[PDB]
Design a protein around this ligand. Structure first.
Ligand SMILES: CC(C)S[C@@H]1O[C@H](CO)[C@H](O)[C@H](O)[C@H]1O
Ligand SMILES: [Mg+2]
Ligand SMILES: [Mg+2]
Ligand code: NA
Ligand code: NA
Ligand code: NA
Ligand code: NA
Lengths: 1014, 210
């Protein structure tokens, strides 16, 4: 066993492991099978096991086989032993966490010894078969029962089952499991995620009778209009064949039995030697089947009864059946004859406290949030999931891409193993045993051959295997250029909408271009797009405009759902979010483990609302007073929807109403708005519509908003000249300052710096740091990319800004004058920002302080055309006051940026100061709000047309601090007011991704602000 | 009412600074009670004889995007040559300027007019940083056309041969000019990125004599 290193042999992936099959429970009562109640024949060993850690399997004491080690501790199972602290979890993206020397792994190979002492009743051993099921063991294990070696298993993400019948005794038994962290299986498990280990999914014991249902497959086929279906059920048995044996497959809609078939064993002739005597195929007619989709997840219950002709039950198995057809026709992916639009997300199995152990609550939380945010699909990135996931997807309604546990990203080249026939056996089992397990789940609509393993001949073989075995689902795979002979769907990752990326051998064409390449006919659905790392999803709207305009652009899966951050604790025992390198793990890929739409605790990032808005199922158009509503449902009518509409003048409500929605799938409804009264006062009328769900569903609460849109209506421009003031501001001059006085107010301009350095209301300072131009931002993850101090990526935005001296450019004064006017004082300034003799930016300003106390600031900036376009053009200052609330007229309520503001609505928003900061785990520029006409904070009011963020954290602190938990609130409030701000990008996070129309390239910029007190 | 809108003065003030005079104006263009455009300008005249013009325009969001945002006047001078640092030498528009090259161009006045058989706005040059004509020089970042025909005559005249040189020279200087389109000529064809929809517009000029 130590002799024979099976964990270093890709030719050995298991020993004595039983055949894979769909979920079993071996009910002995038909009614219990029908209702899906617990089964007495299926026991959970999810309790406290004994555990001990060793640096290598050579260090495991032989005594551990027969007896418990006193050194061992008592730990919860399922678990990852890294989450218990026995050794460290490693975060690496591409580079393998071990030396690349297949089939070999390190001699120092962390070994987890699990054991359990448990009871078996005599009744389980008198007759029949007792098997143990390990749903998940990472990454390879040897199993012993009562001292005796049972078997061995690889593949971390599929159940391993072993017959214990001959090993057990009635009463006290002991299981011993030696789990190896590293194996030859690790070479095929190089997914971009925390590398962990252990018995991390359910362990169970299953009792089956000797004469048993050993396998069953459910197929549903349809006539052209889906008014007729045949359910075909192939059922296999093990045990001794007998003439009196029968199978009954019955189909149920709730408590109504809809169809039933009974036959003895003995299939039709197959070839010259006969048929399968151990198999039967039952076929049931179903008239006007209720069809399954993510829109309406209609399910039936199939009960599979093995019994005698006279009617004694032997055992029953069961599954949920969803009637649906998935096919590709004329280059379109069809579900029930209708072209899908995939509103998808990739989802890793990750919990911040429990690692890679999944639980029902977290699973359900995820589904609810997904459906609540207009997602209809999920990709199992990048392995078969916990078996309950598929059940939940079946029941709530989500389309699933089921993906084999094969990723060889770190090989050179990427297909070095997948093109090697010696690795085909190992690969084949990871595909075959997934299909055998999951093939009865209606939620699974597409099979995937794995991820980032290049394109090798093994892919082509395994592609064809699934096509033979299961014609009911398309097979996709992205490796080796996303349009190879091993995929039914063009499935690129991070291909852009309009921009080609012509990498040699594996180009990523513009998705619109890819579709029409000579000879290309297939549908395109991105397996990964819109990399949601930190402040991201810039340009998301561009994808959806394209998905909606192009039939064959059928959507994609966002990368990804949830940040893979883990909880650590400080000296005060306070929790914080950790990423790569925070466990002494090295090499690592730092914050790249965090790419989620939600935080690890399932709190949303601002990007989620942008995804919800773009993935809406109702589209809107306005013509005069008529709203046109178009449904993008393919199957359901809008029978739990009403349209609320509201017209407001600069945030002030003027009229509202509601109209029920009554839209056929793909249909249109016209809504004529009543005559709206004219406003007296100036300003812009805005129309906002919202789709509300009056009733609760299985996935949402009463009053849930599923869609919205906004339009500008009439605008009445202000022509009224403000009331003339009788006071006139007084200018006081010193060598160091221009001071302006008006009533209880004072303004101070430093003549050496050229900036407003202080402001007084009554006697009190308003500024802690003078008002100064700013052209930089604390860099986003998209700005940073894959650059490092030891290995600069000169193409990354941050590195371009640094090398050009944007971050260390010092303001030099060119002009500072003061003129007294009739009813105002005018300060005129000019500055140059230079780096090593090169003039980067020029800023020319006037400040006009009139008798009404208002300060008008006009700013005109020049940006050298050959310097990298700047992150922002605006001002910043540190205010002295900390106020409770922030009130603004502009886009909100949530964080929004120029290329991620479609979700935001224009209105009057009022939030606590803390909501104006986004707690990204890796800190950066954040909390900006665009299209803002008025900002209110304490006694201050700023007016104009600007973008702003406001918080207790300076841009400097944000860029200097690598974790949110190390941030400290600074004195006062940092205000950044921008005339212009660069896009955030996110098409990917390892190359510049900000689109040209969102780069600040205009050369000359102008903005104006009015600063006053209310 | 774009063609018949009349200016209504909102503000006209003068200020003496240390080495300059500043004129501040604001106008509203209106049609039937509706305000289409607001123009706020400053004119800063210094000791060097330069007049700096700042222009800030508001366009009502429910009025159709205007063809241009600029200034015009009829100059008394008739000069032989037009000299400019900008895109040329030929007529060019925002959606048709890729062929034009940035350089120093010098043409006879009649080359700054394009004799389309059916007369319309014509002879614009974009991306112009400096324009010279007779005793005048304009600097900034603007589009212009210059000819002996007013926009009014061009629009009222159906055939090129019926046009007559007006007294002096008509100068149109635009901070912004709408695309010309052409995908077809029977439905609107100016693409959205070339429509003047920004709502608020800024441009600046310096008028002087060399
Ligand atoms: C060139 C590398 C950045 S590969 C890139 O890394 C990402 C990091 O989140 C994801 O894992 C993507 O799937 C992968 O293609
Ligand atoms: Mg092996
Ligand atoms: Mg990878
Ligand atoms: Na489409
Ligand atoms: Na990642
Ligand atoms: Na930082
Ligand atoms: Na004409």
């Amino acid at each position: 066993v130590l002799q024979r290193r099976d964990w270093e042999n890709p030719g050995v992936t298991q020993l004595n492991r039983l055949a894979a099959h769909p979920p079993f429970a071996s009910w002995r009562n038909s009614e219990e099978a029908r209702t899906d109640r617990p089964s007495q024949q299926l026991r959970s060993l999810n309790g406290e096991w004994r555990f001990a850690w060793f640096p290598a399997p050579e260090a495991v004491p032989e005594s551990w086989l027969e007896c418990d080690l006193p050194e061992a501790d008592t730990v919860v199972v399922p678990s990852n032993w890294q989450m218990h602290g026995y050794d460290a979890p490693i975060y690496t993206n591409v580079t393998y966490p071990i030396t690349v020397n297949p089939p070999f792994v390190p001699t120092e190979n962390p070994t987890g010894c699990y054991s359990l002492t448990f009871n078996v009743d005599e009744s389980w051993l008198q007759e029949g078969q007792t098997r143990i099921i390990f749903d998940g063991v990472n990454s390879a294990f040897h199993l012993w029962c009562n001292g005796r070696w049972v078997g061995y298993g690889q593949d971390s993400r599929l159940p391993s089952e072993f017959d214990l019948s001959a090993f057990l005794r009635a009463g006290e038994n002991r299981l011993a499991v030696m789990v190896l962290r590293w194996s030859d299986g690790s070479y095929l498990e190089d997914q971009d995620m925390w590398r962990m280990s252990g018995i991390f999914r359910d362990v169970s014991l299953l009792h089956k009778p000797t004469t048993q249902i050993s396998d069953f497959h459910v197929a549903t086929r349809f006539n052209d209009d889906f008014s007729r279906a045949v359910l075909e059920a192939e059922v296999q048995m093990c045990g001794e064949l007998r003439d009196y044996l029968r199978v009954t497959v019955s189909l149920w809609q709730g408590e109504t039995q809809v169809a039933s078939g009974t036959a003895p064993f003995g299939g039709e002739i197959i070839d010259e030697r006969g048929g399968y005597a151990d198999r039967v195929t039952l076929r049931l007619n179903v008239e006007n089947p209720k069809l399954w989709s993510a829109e309406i997840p209609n399910l039936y219950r199939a009960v599979v009864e093995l019994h005698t002709a006279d009617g004694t039950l032997i055992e029953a198995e069961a599954c949920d059946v969803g009637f649906r057809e998935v096919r590709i026709e004329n280059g379109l992916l069809l579900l029930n004859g209708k072209p899908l639009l995939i509103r998808g997300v990739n989802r890793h199995e990750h919990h911040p406290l429990h690692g890679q152990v999944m639980d029902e609550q977290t699973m359900v939380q995820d589904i609810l949030l997904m459906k609540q945010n207009n997602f209809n699909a999920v990709r199992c990135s990048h392995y078969p999931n916990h078996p309950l996931w598929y059940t939940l997807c079946d029941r709530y309604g989500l389309y699933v891409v089921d993906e084999a546990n094969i990723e060889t990203h770190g090989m050179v080249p990427m297909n070095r193993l997948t093109d090697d026939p010696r690795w085909l056996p190992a690969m084949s089992e990871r595909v075959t045993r997934m299909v055998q397990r999951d093939r009865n789940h209606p939620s699974v609509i597409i099979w995937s051959l794995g991820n980032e393993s290049g394109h090798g001949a093994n892919h082509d073989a395994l592609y064809r295997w699934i096509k033979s075995v299961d014609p009911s689902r398309p097979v996709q795979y992205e490796g080796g250029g996303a349009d190879t002979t091993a995929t039914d769907i063009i499935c690129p990752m991070y291909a852009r909408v309009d921009e080609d990326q012509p990498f040699p051998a594996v180009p990523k064409w513009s998705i619109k271009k890819w579709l029409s390449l000579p000879g290309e006919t297939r549908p395109l659905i991105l397996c990964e797009y819109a990399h949601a790392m930190g402040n991201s999803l810039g340009g998301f709207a561009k994808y959806w405009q394209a998905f909606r305009q192009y039939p064959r652009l059928q959507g994609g899966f966002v990368w990804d759902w949830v940040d893979q951050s883990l909880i650590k604790y400080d000296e005060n025992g306070n929790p914080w979010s950790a990423y790569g390198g925070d466990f002494g793990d090295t090499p690592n890929d730092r914050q790249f483990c965090m790419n989620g739409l939600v935080f690890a605790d399932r709190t949303p990032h601002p990007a989620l609302t942008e995804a919800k808005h773009q993935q809406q199922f109702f589209q809107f158009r306005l013509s005069g007073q008529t709203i046109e509503v178009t449904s993008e449902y393919l199957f359901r009518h809008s029978d739990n929807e009403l349209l609320h509409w509201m017209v407001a003048l600069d945030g002030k409500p003027l009229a509202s109403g509601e109209v029920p929605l009554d839209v056929a799938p793909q249909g249109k409804q016209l809504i004529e708005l009543p005559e709206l009264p004219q406003p007296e006062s100036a300003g812009q009328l805005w129309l906002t519509v919202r789709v509300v769900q009056p009733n609760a569903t299985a996935w949402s609460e009463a009053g849930h908003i599923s869609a919205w849109q906004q339009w500008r209506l009439a605008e009445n421009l202000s022509v009224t000249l403000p009331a003339a003031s009788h006071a006139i501001p007084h200018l006081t001059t010193s060598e160091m300052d221009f001071c302006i006085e008006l009533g209880n107010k004072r303004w101070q301009f430093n003549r050496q710096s050229g900036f407003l350095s202080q402001m007084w209301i009554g006697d009190k300072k308003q500024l802690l740091t003078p008002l100064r131009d700013q052209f930089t931002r604390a860099p986003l993850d998209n700005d940073i990319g894959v650059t490092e101090a030891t290995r600069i990526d000169p193409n990354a935005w941050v590195e371009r800004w640094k090398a050009a001296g944007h971050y260390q450019a010092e303001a030099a004064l060119l002009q500072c004058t003061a003129d007294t006017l009739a009813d105002a004082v005018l300060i005129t300034t000019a500055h140059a920002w230079q780096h090593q003799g090169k003039t980067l930016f020029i800023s020319r300003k006037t400040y006009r302080i009139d008798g009404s106390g208002q300060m008008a600031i006009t700013v005109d900036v020049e940006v050298a055309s050959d310097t990298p376009h700047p992150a922002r053009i605006g001002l910043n200052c540190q205010l002295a006051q900390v106020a409770e609330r922030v009130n603004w007229l502009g886009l909100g309520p949530q964080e929004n940026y120029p290329d991620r503001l479609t979700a935001a609505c224009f209105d009057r928003w009022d939030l606590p100061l803390s909501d104006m900061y986004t707690p990204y785990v890796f800190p950066s520029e954040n909390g900006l709000r665009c299209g803002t006409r008025e900002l209110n904070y304490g006694p201050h009011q700023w007016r104009g047309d600007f973008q702003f963020n406001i918080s207790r954290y300076s841009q400097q602190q944000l860029m200097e601090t690598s974790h949110r938990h190390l941030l400290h609130a600074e004195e006062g409030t940092w205000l950044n007011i921008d005339g212009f701000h660069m896009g955030i990008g996110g098409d990917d996070s390892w190359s510049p991704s900000v689109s040209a129309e969102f780069q600040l390239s205009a050369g000359r910029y102008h903005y104006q602000l009015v600063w006053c007190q209310k």
